[PDB]
């Protein structure tokens, strides 16, 4: 009796859905009365499956309403763990243990990437007479990102960035400008360098 994993490394994007496969030999008809399934992640209990019975109250709080064992896959020898809306705390080493006329287990490493690729922008006309505009870009991600404001000719402009807690980074640029002028807000993380940029076009008043 051996449990096998087709992949022991998963790299997943924040907020996505993930199914970790965990295979074990089943001959034709699954004997539910002899099957135990245990999904664990670094002292956190995810799935405690006994002869078809699960009790959601023993599932760790951080996984509640997000982690489930696919019963359809179980019948075919695949103790597949599905995690929806993946978070940063889902990164780690998962252990899937199967008891089914013998017992075995395998480790699966999960990495979660949270890039700043969803930039929310807004442009406010705070004073039409003086043509003063307030440009704001906000994004969530990990790790910490700096925000660089540039003009259309790529000259760096001075804005105000506020970082609070996954990081929530917002930055605001107050500038006197006119319709159709173009500005860029760039969210930059390092080690290694990764950039995500939104283009902001000054609209009609």
């Amino acid at each position: 009796f051996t449990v096998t994993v087709p992949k022991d490394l998963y790299v997943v994007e924040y907020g996505s859905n993930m199914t970790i496969e965990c295979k074990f030999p089943v001959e034709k008809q699954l004997d539910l009365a002899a099957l135990i399934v245990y999904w664990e992640m670094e002292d956190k209990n995810i799935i405690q499956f006994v002869h078809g019975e699960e009790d959601l109250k023993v599932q760790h709080s951080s996984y509640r309403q997000r982690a489930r064992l696919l019963k359809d896959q179980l019948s075919l020898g695949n103790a597949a763990l599905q995690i929806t809306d993946v978070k940063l705390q889902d990164a780690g080493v998962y252990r899937c243990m199967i008891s089914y006329g013998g017992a075995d287990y395998k480790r699966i490493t999960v990495k979660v990437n949270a890039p700043y690729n969803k930039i929310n922008q807004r442009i406010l006309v705070v004073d039409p007479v003086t043509s003063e505009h307030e440009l704001t870009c906000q994004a969530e991600g990990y790790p910490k990102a700096e925000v660089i404001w540039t003009s259309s000719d790529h000259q760096v402009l001075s804005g105000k960035t506020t970082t609070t807690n996954l990081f929530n980074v917002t930055s605001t640029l107050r500038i006197n400008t006119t319709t159709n002028e173009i500005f860029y807000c760039t969210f930059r993380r390092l080690d290694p360098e990764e950039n995500h940029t939104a283009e902001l076009v000054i609209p009609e008043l």
């Binding site: 245990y38 209990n45 405690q48 019975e53 009790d55 023993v58």
Partner: peptide, 15 residues
């Protein structure tokens, strides 16, 4: 272990 209503711990133990 292996009561589905009780917490478990690695490996095949009480949690």
């Amino acid at each position: 272990f292996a009561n589905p209503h009780l917490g478990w711990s690695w490996x095949x133990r009480x949690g």
